[PDB]
């Protein structure tokens, strides 16, 4: 299929959503699955 | 007992050295004299239109002996300033690269400093004896 993209055609790794991405941190996922994942990123939660 | 620039004030030293180059020794002619802003954040050329260069040389020569290994790219952010970017808040803007490059190339053949490896320039002995002797005479000019 004729397609160009190549300018930010990145979706969520775990849910394939082109909504707000955090990215530049090794996760490239959405905020909601980032919330309901737990114990993997920033789990310490001292603060 | 041996006087260096550190033992004397910064302002009177760079003024005495500026008058030294004003009167003795030819620094260079920039070509775009008193038609540039000496930076990008500014919009007015220096009021001391006939000068601003030999005192420019005095400041950079003092600092290149103050610091050890810095380049023109570093000199741009050293003498940068906040720019009134219209309605936007003030942001730091680096100085003009050509002005800092021109004065540095002006002073290479003078001998005030020599090219250093691994980046930057390192002070030569010919260019620091005079840079240090001027401090040994500038503190006695008051009396």
């Amino acid at each position: 299929h004729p397609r160009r993209y190549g300018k930010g055609s990145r979706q969520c790794r775990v849910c394939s959503s082109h909504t707000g991405l955090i990215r530049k941190y090794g996760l490239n996922i959405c905020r909601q699955c980032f919330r309901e994942k737990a114990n993997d990123i920033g789990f310490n939660k001292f603060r | 007992p041996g006087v260096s620039v550190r033992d004397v004030a910064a302002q009177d030293f760079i003024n005495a050295y500026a008058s030294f180059l004003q009167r003795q020794g030819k620094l260079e002619v920039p070509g775009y004299v008193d038609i540039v802003k000496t930076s990008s954040g500014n919009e007015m050329p220096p009021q001391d239109a006939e000068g601003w260069f030999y005192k420019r040389a005095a400041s950079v020569a003092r600092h290149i002996y103050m610091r050890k290994q810095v380049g023109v790219g570093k000199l741009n952010k050293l003498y940068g300033g906040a720019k009134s970017r219209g309605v936007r808040p003030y942001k730091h803007i680096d100085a003009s690269g050509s002005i800092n490059r021109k004065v540095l190339q002006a002073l290479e053949k003078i001998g005030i400093v020599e090219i250093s490896p691994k980046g930057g320039r390192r002070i030569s002995e010919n260019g620091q004896r005079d840079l240090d002797r001027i401090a040994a005479q500038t503190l006695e000019e008051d009396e």
Binding site: - | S4, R6, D7, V8, A9, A10
Partner: protein, 141 residues
């Protein structure tokens, strides 16, 4: 060997390590002496530790202080504590007690921050506000 002691000072972001040794009695910071640290008003403020008992205590003692970090007034606030603490360390290393107790009581009875580090550190900023103890505009109806 060489008789030398070293102390250090603190500020909001300024640290002032001081090197004290017995010599011809010199004072300098960053290679520049005391009368050039460029507060241009607080010049007397940094003179304060070394003036209220005179120069008899600095006849043959070289002290050198290196300062890094902090604001301009914070930078100036760093040397006075370093030289005062270095003065105490020299009093604690080479000279007798009768001179030491008089020196310290003159320091403490006048000003606290000469030897007492300030523990008033900035408070972290809170969510929903520009500052630590500031809140956004509500603007309801």
């Amino acid at each position: 060997a060489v008789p030398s002691v070293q102390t250090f000072g603190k500020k909001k972001s300024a640290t002032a390590v001081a090197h004290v040794k017995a010599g011809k009695g010199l004072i300098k910071v960053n290679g520049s002496p005391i009368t050039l640290v460029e507060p241009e008003i607080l010049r007397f403020k940094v003179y304060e530790p070394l003036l209220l008992v005179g120069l008899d205590k600095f006849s043959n003692i070289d002290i050198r202080v290196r300062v890094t970090g902090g604001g301009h007034v914070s930078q100036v606030y760093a040397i006075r504590q370093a030289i005062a603490k270095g003065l105490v360390a020299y009093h604690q290393k080479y000279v007798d007690e009768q001179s030491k107790n008089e020196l310290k009581k003159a320091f403490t009875s006048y000003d606290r921050t000469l030897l007492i580090a300030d523990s008033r550190r900035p408070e972290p900023k809170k969510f929903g506000g520009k500052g630590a103890r500031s809140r956004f505009q509500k603007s309801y109806r």
